[PDB]
Design a protein around this motif. Structure first.
Motif, PDB file in Angstrom:
ATOM      1  N   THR C   8       0.828  -1.205   0.000  1.00  0.00           N
ATOM      2  CA  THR C   8       0.000   0.000   0.000  1.00  0.00           C
ATOM      3  C   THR C   8       0.866   1.260   0.000  1.00  0.00           C
ATOM      4  O   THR C   8       0.730   2.142   0.850  1.00  0.00           O
ATOM      5  CB  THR C   8      -0.961  -0.002   1.191  1.00  0.00           C
ATOM      6  OG1 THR C   8      -1.576  -1.291   1.310  1.00  0.00           O
ATOM      7  CG2 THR C   8      -2.045   1.053   1.008  1.00  0.00           C
ATOM      8  N   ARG C   9       1.773   1.334  -0.974  1.00  0.00           N
ATOM      9  CA  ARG C   9       2.615   2.514  -1.176  1.00  0.00           C
ATOM     10  C   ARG C   9       3.414   2.850   0.084  1.00  0.00           C
ATOM     11  O   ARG C   9       3.433   3.990   0.553  1.00  0.00           O
ATOM     12  CB  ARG C   9       1.771   3.709  -1.624  1.00  0.00           C
ATOM     13  CG  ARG C   9       1.167   3.550  -3.010  1.00  0.00           C
ATOM     14  CD  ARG C   9       2.167   3.904  -4.098  1.00  0.00           C
ATOM     15  NE  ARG C   9       1.630   3.669  -5.433  1.00  0.00           N
ATOM     16  CZ  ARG C   9       2.360   3.623  -6.539  1.00  0.00           C
ATOM     17  NH1 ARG C   9       3.672   3.795  -6.510  1.00  0.00           N
ATOM     18  NH2 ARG C   9       1.759   3.399  -7.704  1.00  0.00           N
ATOM     19  N   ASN C  10       4.079   1.836   0.636  1.00  0.00           N
ATOM     20  CA  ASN C  10       4.958   1.990   1.795  1.00  0.00           C
ATOM     21  C   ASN C  10       6.295   1.345   1.458  1.00  0.00           C
ATOM     22  O   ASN C  10       6.591   0.227   1.902  1.00  0.00           O
ATOM     23  CB  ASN C  10       4.342   1.367   3.049  1.00  0.00           C
ATOM     24  CG  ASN C  10       3.484   2.346   3.826  1.00  0.00           C
ATOM     25  OD1 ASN C  10       3.910   3.461   4.127  1.00  0.00           O
ATOM     26  ND2 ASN C  10       2.266   1.932   4.157  1.00  0.00           N
ATOM     27  N   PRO C  11       7.132   2.020   0.668  1.00  0.00           N
ATOM     28  CA  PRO C  11       8.411   1.419   0.276  1.00  0.00           C
ATOM     29  C   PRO C  11       9.307   1.175   1.481  1.00  0.00           C
ATOM     30  O   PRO C  11       9.281   1.916   2.466  1.00  0.00           O
ATOM     31  CB  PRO C  11       9.018   2.455  -0.677  1.00  0.00           C
ATOM     32  CG  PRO C  11       8.359   3.740  -0.334  1.00  0.00           C
ATOM     33  CD  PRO C  11       7.004   3.418   0.219  1.00  0.00           C
ATOM     34  N   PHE C  13      13.213   0.616   1.973  1.00  0.00           N
ATOM     35  CA  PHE C  13      14.563   0.572   1.442  1.00  0.00           C
ATOM     36  C   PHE C  13      15.415  -0.410   2.250  1.00  0.00           C
ATOM     37  O   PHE C  13      15.174  -0.615   3.442  1.00  0.00           O
ATOM     38  CB  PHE C  13      15.198   1.958   1.478  1.00  0.00           C
ATOM     39  CG  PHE C  13      14.421   3.002   0.728  1.00  0.00           C
ATOM     40  CD1 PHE C  13      13.440   3.745   1.364  1.00  0.00           C
ATOM     41  CD2 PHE C  13      14.675   3.245  -0.611  1.00  0.00           C
ATOM     42  CE1 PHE C  13      12.725   4.707   0.677  1.00  0.00           C
ATOM     43  CE2 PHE C  13      13.964   4.206  -1.303  1.00  0.00           C
ATOM     44  CZ  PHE C  13      12.987   4.938  -0.658  1.00  0.00           C
TER      45      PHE C  13
END
Lengths: 62, 62, 31
Positions: C8-11, C13
């Motif tokens: 849900t658009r929570n990258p 890294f």
């Protein structure tokens, strides 16, 4: 409701980054409204299907 | 600030030098975009500054 | 053998602390 936009939707959103940074700076230095709305509506969540509305709200904070 | 697609493309590369070069290229592209945006913003800010200082003096008077 | 986490658009890294907040309560049952 004219919403003409360029086909290249890659560098157009950079000014969106600048605008959100400016709004964040204004609210931090000049607290007017709660920051919860900022958390709810985040540019990185892709939920901004109408960037014009977001820009209008940001200008409304002015 | 590269998009998730760019990060996935970097992850795709296997050889260490290849991924390092791809990351360096992405950094260069992001830096170029940021510099272009900063220069455009500086030009716009100067154009606003092209407005006479009489505007600031009138603001002080008010 | 677990269901895929709804990003849900929570990258996330590599080697970077991040917070995931998904409105769906279904993930709460799994957690």
């Amino acid at each position: 409701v004219v919403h003409e936009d360029f086909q290249v939707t890659e560098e157009v959103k950079a000014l969106t980054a600048e605008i959100v940074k400016t709004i964040r700076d204004i609210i931090a230095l000049n607290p007017l409204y709660r920051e919860s709305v900022l958390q709810m509506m985040q540019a990185g969540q892709r939920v901004v299907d109408n960037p014009i509305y977001l820009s209008d709200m940001g200008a409304a904070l002015t | 600030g590269a998009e998730s697609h760019e990060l996935q493309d970097v992850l795709e590369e296997t050889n260490i030098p290849k991924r390092l070069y791809k990351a360096l290229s992405l950094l260069k592209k992001e830096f170029e975009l940021s510099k272009l945006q900063q220069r455009l913003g500086r030009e716009v800010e100067e154009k606003i500054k092209q407005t006479h200082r009489k505007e600031l003096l009138q603001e002080q008077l008010k | 053998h677990l269901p895929l986490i709804a990003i849900t658009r929570n990258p996330v890294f590599p080697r970077f602390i991040k917070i995931i907040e998904v409105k769906n309560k279904k993930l709460v049952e799994l957690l």
